[PDB]
Structure 1
């Protein structure tokens, strides 16, 4: 629920689209068992898809560790120092490809609740409403029941 969870406002990392666009995903860390039934789809991902993926975005450095694990993981690290550890346990190659592209496409900000769907930093251009917009002035700045 929203009152149990933390929330935040919609943001970028360093104004990520203004000047240029920067891929926010630094490192991936696959760890894949050689003999092991859970990292089968990871194995077929390293053999088929990880080299193509590693070429489609060179700003991402990818480490395939290949130790005897009992659950394989991917660990995405982001430029703002966030770490998302997700499992690729008993997943097909296609499911792992959609997960890794999902991690590539996003940023390191939390996937907690976002309060507003928008973020201007300059919301007003004609000048924000204060209670003396849309009011006429008087002669000599008088107020009601002011004599002189």
Structure 2
């Protein structure tokens, strides 16, 4: 007799079959008064239009935020955010910072430990002393 377990579900592998960019929204805040936003205002007029036209899967929201530095706040599918203050940055520095939020995921930064990350079982199995030619001391 075989009883079925109904607590296990399938897991998604973003990239296999279909790809989905993790960055889903980009909040672009500026200031018409703060001098630290002179570069941000230029990024919104010179480079943001073409950058947004090339990333139609991201939602761009340009809203003023007077009395505050300019920030680039990205929202990710995992539910986290990443805000980068771009005060006193030139337009091309803003673009390089915006491409960082696009290419990035919401996951927290982690030190480099292992290149490969796998969930499927070993093709050759795991070693066992009871499945070889034995060992004589």
SS in 1 for 2:116: coil
**What is the CA–CA distance in structure 2 between the aligned matches of 1:51 and 1:14, rounded to whole Å?**
33
Structure 1 position 69, deviation (Å) = 3.1
The structure whose Rg is larger is 1
Structure 1 position 76, deviation (Å) = 0.6
Q: Which moved more, 1:13-22 or 1:101-110?
A: 13-22
- Per the alignment, residue 104 of structure 1 pairs with 102
- Per the alignment, residue 16 of structure 1 pairs with 14
**What is the CA–CA distance in structure 2 between the aligned matches of 1:36 and 1:14, rounded to whole Å?**
45
1:13-53 CA distances to partner (integer Å, 9 max, x unpaired)? Answer: 94221111111001111110112210011000000111111
Selected match of 2:91 from 86, 90, 93: 93
Moved over 6 A (4+): none
Give the structure with the larger strand fraction. Answer: 2
Instruction: Write out aligned runs for 1:30-109 (5 A).
Output: 30-109=28-107
**What is the CA–CA distance in structure 2 between the aligned matches of 1:119 and 1:46, rounded to whole Å?**
38
Aligned residues: 124
- Per the alignment, residue 130 of structure 1 pairs with 128
RMSD: 1.7
SS in 2 for 1:113: coil
**What is the CA–CA distance in structure 2 between the aligned matches of 1:70 and 1:130, rounded to whole Å?**
62
Note the residue ranges of structure 2 that are not aligned, 5 or more in a row. 1-10
Structure 1 position 123, deviation (Å) = 4.9
SS in 2 for 1:20: coil
